[model samples]
Target: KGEELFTGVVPILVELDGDVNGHKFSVSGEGEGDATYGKLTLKFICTTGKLPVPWPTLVTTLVQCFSRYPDHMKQHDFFKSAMPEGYVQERTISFKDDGNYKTRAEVKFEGDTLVNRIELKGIDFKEDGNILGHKLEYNYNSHNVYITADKQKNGIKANFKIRHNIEDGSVQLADHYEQNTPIGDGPVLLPDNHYLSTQSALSKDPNEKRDHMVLLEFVTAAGIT
Candidate 1:
């Protein structure tokens, strides 16, 4: 019984590196995985100048990246589900110093959702100026992508979360989750346990758009070899 393993979950990590709109961007997060399966649950942050509109670009880019996955991997129930779209809840906090600078935080749960948590902080206050060096920090978390077999459905799952700072404060969060979203199956395993994917276009419109690629690695937290 000990010799033969039936089911287990492995912790998978992912990183996407590419040029997007003349900007060198690298998205790092955790991926859902098992012995031989994987799903993507990448996290991202939306803040002012950092990712002016992370939601729109990210959702599109990720969906395209996953579209290259194996056909058999996408048939699982976890992979079948989509990101929840909940309402938005926000709160404001007032600061006493620097002319009472105002900051806030926002969170989401379901209904075309992606922005899990966001917080705005003011720093580098000038003597005469009210606020200087304005930057916003945000977080994106999701867990709806996964890979599993037919009977037991044991494999990798996806989770994405990011904490980033943006300048100028003009963050635009968008939700473009659709039913039965398309994602890739698995990546090419290299000699050093590295899983890499081929370059993929962000949009399905056929026109030349931004191309993105992702790399995945696994680490077993539990006692599973």
Candidate 2:
């Protein structure tokens, strides 16, 4: 059984920043993830440790299911554009857990060393936007990708945050609170039925390892501690 692959929790440390009515408020928390049932649910309780918000919505529970890219063929271009010269195979997983954002998981090879990297350039698109809280309107725009090439380790850039235009004006909520090379946004996968179908699909043709084993990077990347 592959139950272990789909079970357990991953703890996370996040510095959540929000712009409410043109004021800045940041809160840090030790959140967790529920990695079960083929979906990863990020659970966080908002608390103002030193920073405070203007509104009365003090303890907001933020829950987001990581975005899934099951249909890789349909999203081919979305992943390709983020890659560079090496052009080795890449496993572009969900960098953000939003329903509307994306990122790239690229793998490049050197003579003896290989690079397992994730790029965040040109990874923005729109679904819609909203002015009326009664209705729904949202657009996904990527501001920047703050990364550099150096001798040692890689780092983050102001490179995250999807801007939102509300009825009052506009607000910038920074979701890329983690300042690191890879933000470790776990992947939400296909439905349970898809697993069952794939199991039988491969079981019938045992030599067709390409169909299932090829998904290694994605399924493993989704596994965060």
Best candidate according to lDDT? 1
Query: Runs in model 2 with CA error above 4 Å?
Result: 1-8, 13-30, 34-40, 46-51, 54-148, 152-161, 169-225
In terms of TM-score, which candidate is strongest?
2
Query: What are the lDDT scores of the predictions, listed in order?
Result: 0.27, 0.25
Write the residue-wise lDDT of candidate 2 on 106-206 in tens digits.
33222322233332221222223221121111222323322222113222222223343333555534343222222222321122111110100001125
Question: Which run of 10 residues does model 2 get worst, by summed lDDT?
Answer: 193-202
What is candidate 1's TM-score against the reference? 0.24
Instruction: Estimate candidate 1's RMSD in Å.
Output: 15.9
TM-score of every candidate relative to the true structure: 0.24, 0.25
Q: How close to the true structure is residue 112 of candidate 2, measured as C-alpha lDDT?
A: 21
Q: What's the distance in Å from true for residue 143, model 1? A: 11
